[PDB]
Amino acid sequence: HHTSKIEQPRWASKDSAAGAASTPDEKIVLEFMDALTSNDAAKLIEYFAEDTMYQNMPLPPAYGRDAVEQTLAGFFTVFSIDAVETFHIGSSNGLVYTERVDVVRALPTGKSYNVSVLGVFQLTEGKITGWRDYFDLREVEEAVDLPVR
Amino acid sequence: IEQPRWASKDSAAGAASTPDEKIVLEFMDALTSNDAAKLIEYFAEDTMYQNMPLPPAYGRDAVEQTLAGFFTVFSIDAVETFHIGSSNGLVYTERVDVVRALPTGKSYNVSVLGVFQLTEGKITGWRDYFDLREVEEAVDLPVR
Numbered sequence: 698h699h700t701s702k703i704e705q706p707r708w709a710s711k712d713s714a715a716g717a718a719s720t721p722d723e724k725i726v727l728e729f730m731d732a733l734t735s736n737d738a739a740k741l742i743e744y745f746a747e748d749t750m751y752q753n754m755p756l757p758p759a760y761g762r763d764a765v766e767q768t769l770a771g772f773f774t775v776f777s778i779d780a781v782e783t784f785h786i787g788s789s790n791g792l793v794y795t796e797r798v799d800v801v802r803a804l805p806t807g808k809s810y811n812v813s814v815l816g817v818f819q820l821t822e823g824k825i826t827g828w829r830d831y832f833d834l835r836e837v838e839e840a841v842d843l844p845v846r
Numbered sequence: 847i848e849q850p851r852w853a854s855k856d857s858a859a860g861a862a863s864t865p866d867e868k869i870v871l872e873f874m875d876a877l878t879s880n881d882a883a884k885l886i887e888y889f890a891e892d893t894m895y896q897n898m899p900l901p902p903a904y905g906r907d908a909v910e911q912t913l914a915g916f917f918t919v920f921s922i923d924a925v926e927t928f929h930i931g932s933s934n935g936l937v938y939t940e941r942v943d944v945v946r947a948l949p950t951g952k953s954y955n956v957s958v959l960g961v962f963q964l965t966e967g968k969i970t971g972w973r974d975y976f977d978l979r980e981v982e983e984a985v986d987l988p989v990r
């Protein structure tokens with residue numbers, strides 16, 4: 698499958714280091730973003746602590762590493778993440794933030810959508826203890842013609 | 847507004863530690879004014895605003911218009927910021943905003959993650975990410 702390059706939005710920061718990972722935890726998060734296109738829940742779960750959580754905010758949360766892996770495995774049964782572009786990354790107080798676009802493709806329909814997402818990651822000892830992504834679900838569902846909620 | 851299960855127990859996570867973060871938290875406090883003319887004073891001439899499920903506004907005049915339009919329909923009754931952080935001139939806030947639709951009188955606690963770009967203590971960009979359909983269904987108002 699061919700995926701077109703994600704363009705830079707108008708509001709992308711004039712600060713050239715805004716998209717640069719400047720700490721070990723930020724670097725882990727950008728590596729994790731790169732790994733998303735693997736569509737491989739077993740690969741991704743290795744980034745997570747045992748005590749952890751994951752939530753796409755328009756949907757119910759998953760608590761615990763097993764449940765997070767199961768949620769991811771379920772997601773990748775239906776969707777492919779074809780590309781991730783992280784415009785901005787920052788962090789304070791043990792939380793890392795990423796402003797991104799993820800290209801999501803619904804396997805049942807063949808249709809894709811570039812999702813605008815702002816995500817937050819909590820890390821302890823270099824492991825993810827929480828990951829929440831904020832975006833509008835209805836836009837995605839309408840674009841890929843697949844109800845998710 | 848309840849503390850989410852995933853919210854940091856360390857109160858420092860929600861406290862401003864930089865001048866830009868302090869400004870953003872002052873701005874969050876000011877939102878309950880529901881007053882676009884007051885709020886626009888926080889913005890640079892070169893700026894933008896977008897609730898991500900809706901169209902963006904570019905330039906200070908357009909941002910003021912969009913804010914004014916918003917406050918004709920909604921009141922912001924409270925803003926609670928659980929987490930705040932920043933790097934490279936961008937501030938991030940994980941919050942719950944309590945919004946009330948004036949036409950229906952119904953309220954909803956919206957989970958929002960927002961980003962603010964600042965230059966010289968003024969806002970050059972503000973984007974809030976959340977699910978709009980949830981708000982619409984809770985306050986009985988077809989916003990989009």
Ligand SMILES: O[C@H]1CCCC[C@@H]1O
Pocket residue numbers: 753778799801812814830832837
């Ligand atoms: O940001 C999320 C939005 C929903 C599908 C996966 C994407 O990465």
